[PDB]
Amino acid sequence: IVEGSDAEIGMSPWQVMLFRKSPQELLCGASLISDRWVLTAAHCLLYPPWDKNFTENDLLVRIGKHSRTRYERNIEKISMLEKIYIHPRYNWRENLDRDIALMKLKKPVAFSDYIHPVCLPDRETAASLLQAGYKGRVTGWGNLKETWTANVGKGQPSVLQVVNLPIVERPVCKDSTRIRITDNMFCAGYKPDEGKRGDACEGDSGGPFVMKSPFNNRWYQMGIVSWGEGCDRDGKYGFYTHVFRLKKWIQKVIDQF
């Protein structure tokens, strides 16, 4: 997260960390959607050009975290994966279309003050909230700048970061990138003329873009941090997987498995 700020304790109880076993490193963010299911980006797990193809045994999921690096014995829970499901028509060849993946936990997690699932949107919610000019929130432990001076600059955050970003008109999203953007994506971020800044960055990928409904007070995951060109560049926008458009696949996987 670029130009964000420290999260409060328990502000994102659905935030999940994808932890690589060996070497120990932060892979990606993700979100909790029930006691046994985790949602993330497909490209966090599978990308054939860089021979990237992780496996149930290659990873740990860490739930309930505040600190990026501490083992928060009292508070976090660490789970192993039973199975990974990647959308069958995930297009890693040309534009990361359908960048979505589910993960089934080996055992269920007990909810607590620090661990709680986010809602997925229905048709009515998605139609009301996904409008240009409305703001959502992105959280993660990703980088604080695109680039920085080695062994001096900071770097990586020590606690979870949060930024609020506006959704941007489909025409402006299209004009800003030479990539073929589909209807399974939206873009968000501030326009050059607006004087605020903010973006996801390396390590935030797979984490949730959420919005709060003023009528029932619930939080809904509308997006997944997917791709962008650098971090917080002028005239550039972050692109997010469109969770509602892909809900039928989610529905199939959870029901059948």
Partner: peptide, 30 residues
Amino acid sequence: GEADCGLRPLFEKKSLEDKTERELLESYID
């Protein structure tokens, strides 16, 4: 019925708000 979701134990459930959620809600009414 439907499982509870999107209500944070330390916020919604205790009627407290986080530092920046007001910014989200106001975006709705411009």
